[PDB]
Chains A and B, each alone.
Chain A
C-alpha cells in the first residue's frame, strides 16, 4: 500500500521487477496498467514507459536502473553476491543480458508475423544457448551461490520467450536444470502464472 508497481502484460521489465519485489517481501501492491484511464496513465508515467515504481512523489521507470534501485531501496535480502569479485561479474552479466540478449526477444516480437524469419531467429538463439551450456554447470543459480538480480533478468526473459514459442526443454542440459530450479522458486512462479 505504501509503494506501487505499475506493470504491463507480457513485458520482461515488468516481470523481472515483480520477481525482485517478491524476493524482497515488500508490502508493495501490483497494479496492472491498461485497466487505468489515459488520464491516470499519462500521470503515472509521463512518457508512457512501463513498468513504473513510485512511492510518495518519486517515480522511476528507467529500465537499466529500476532493479538496482529496488535492491538498494529494500536492502534485505541482498540480490547481489556478497563477495566483491562475484558481484563485479554479476554486474557485467546484467549489462550483457540487457544489451545482447533482451534485443533478441525484442526482434522476435517485432517479426513474429514472418514465420520463416522466426524459425531462423529461434535457431540462432538455440545455438547461442547451447554454446554457453558449460557456464550453467556447478551452481544452483546463475554463476552465484544464491539468488541474484541476474536470475530475475533471466526468468523474465524465459517467461517471455516461452510465450513467443521458444521453449527451453530437455536438450539444453544444465541450462534446462537451471530453468527447472528457476521456475521452482516462489517469486518466479508467482509471476509466471497467467
Chain B
C-alpha cells in the first residue's frame, strides 16, 4: 500500500530509496518526472501542499520532509535499527543530520535550478567544498563513538549513508572533493562501492 513519489536526479529521492531498500520494505517507486506517471503527479499535488518530492504516502498519511520521512520509515520498518541505541547519540545523530541537510543537501538541490548565475552557482559549490571534509570527519567520529558503545549492535549509520550521496552528487556536479589524504580518498571510494548504494543508482 506504500508509495514513494520520486524525481530523477533528486538527492533526497535517492537517499530514501536506499533506506527503503535496506529495511527490506517494498514500496512502489514512482518517478513523477516521467510522462507515463503523470496521473500520479496529479495525485501528488492533491495530497501535498506543493507536490513535495519525495513523498512517502500510504492510505493513512503522506509525509515529505527528509527528517520526517526517515523517522516514519523507522516506525514502519524497525529492522535494522536506523539510529544509534542511546538517547544522547540519537539526538546527536539528528542534530548532525539537520546540519548535513542545511549545508549540503538543499544546496545540492539549489544547484539544479536552471536560472542560477555563474557567480551564484560557484559560491554554492565553493562553500560546500569548504566544509565537506570537516563534515565527513565528524560523521566518521560519531560513527566510531556509536560502534564503541555497541559493538554487537549493527544499525544503518544513516549519516554515513547520506554522506555517500553527497559525494556521489559532488561527482555528478563536477565538484572536486578537496583532500589529498589518501585514506579519506580510500574511504570515499569504498563508500561509493557498497552494494546497496550501487543497486540504488541502478
Please report A residues at the B interface, Cβ cutoff 8 Å.
Answer: 58, 60, 62, 64-65, 68-69, 72-73, 84-85, 87-89, 91-92, 95
Contacts and interface: CB of A to CB of B under 8 A. Distances in A.
Helix, strand, loop or mixed for chain A's interface? Answer: helix
Contacts of A73: 87-88
A163 B63 CA distance: 33
At the interface, is chain B mostly helix, strand, loop or mixed? helix
Interface in B88-130: 88, 90-91, 94-95, 98
Interface stretch (B16-24, B38-46, B67-75): B67-75
Given A73-B87, A88-B72, A92-B68, A62 B95 contact: yes
Interface in B56-70: 58, 60-61, 63, 65, 67-68
A85 B2 CA distance: 12
Give the interface residue-count category, chain B.
10 to 19
Interface of B: 58, 60-61, 63, 65, 67-68, 71-72, 75-76, 87-88, 90-91, 94-95, 98
A24 B201 CA distance: 45
B98 A64 contact: yes
Contact of B87 (A62, A72, A87, A92): A72
Contacts of A88: 60-61, 63, 68, 71-72, 75-76
A64 B95 CA distance: 8
Given A84-B75, A85-B58, A88-B61, A65 B67 contact: no
A178 B61 CA distance: 23
Contacts of A95: 65, 67-68
B28 to A, nearest CB: 18
Nearest to A73: B87
Contacts of A68: 91, 94
